[PDB]
């Protein structure tokens, strides 16, 4: 029941909230200065919008996999490590980075 997290750095947070509310037919689950997120059931998705002041276009901020509990984060951390990937754990999260620099977190909310 895990789901992808897509975090986008957007030049215009307000415009982006409006667009994504239309695209996914639902409003944001959380709104803070410079930040919003959407919890989408179908397709299963955690969409995070981070305002990038002065940015000329939307870019990838980071990626992730949102899992149900801490045990699953721990399982993923061990599995990824034993596969030979360099990992950094928080505590609950584990981070890895792809060869072109894109960061992924496996995390529980
Ligand atoms: Na990008
Ligand atoms: Ni995140």
Swiss-Prot record:
Keyword tags: Dioxygenase, Iron, Metal-binding, Oxidoreductase
Binding-site residues, roxarsone (III): 61
Any GO BP annotation: response to cadmium ion
Catalytic activity: methylarsonous acid + AH2 + O2 = arsenite + methanol + A + H(+); roxarsone (III) + AH2 + O2 = 4-hydroxy-3-nitrocyclohexa-2,5-dien-1-one + arsenite + A + H(+); nitarsone (III) + AH2 + O2 = 4-nitrocyclohexa-2,5-dien-1-one + arsenite + A + H(+); 4-aminophenylarsonous acid + AH2 + O2 = 4-aminocyclohexa-2,5-dien-1-one + arsenite + A
Keyword Ion transport: no
Quaternary structure and interacting proteins, as annotated: Monomer.
Record remark: domains: The thiolates of the vicinal cysteine pair (Cys95-Cys96) directly coordinate the arsenic atom of the organoarsenical substrate.
Descriptive protein name: Trivalent organoarsenical cleaving enzyme
Organism: Thermomonospora curvata (strain ATCC 19995 / DSM 43183 / JCM 3096 / KCTC 9072 / NBRC 15933 / NCIMB 10081 / Henssen B9)
Span within the parent record: 1 to 118 of 151
């Amino acid at each position: 029941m895990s789901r992808v997290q897509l975090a986008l750095r957007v030049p215009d947070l307000e415009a982006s909230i409006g667009f994504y509310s239309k695209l996914f037919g639902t409003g944001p689950a959380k709104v803070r200065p410079g930040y919003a997120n959407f919890a989408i059931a179908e397709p299963p998705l955690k969409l995070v919008l981070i305002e990038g002041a002065g940015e000329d276009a939307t870019r990838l901020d980071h990626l992730g996999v949102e899992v149900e509990d801490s045990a699953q984060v721990g399982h993923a951390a061990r599995r990824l490590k034993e596969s030979g990937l360099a990992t950094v754990e928080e505590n609950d999260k584990v981070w890895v980075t792809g060869p072109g620099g894109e960061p992924w977190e496996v995390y529980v909310v």
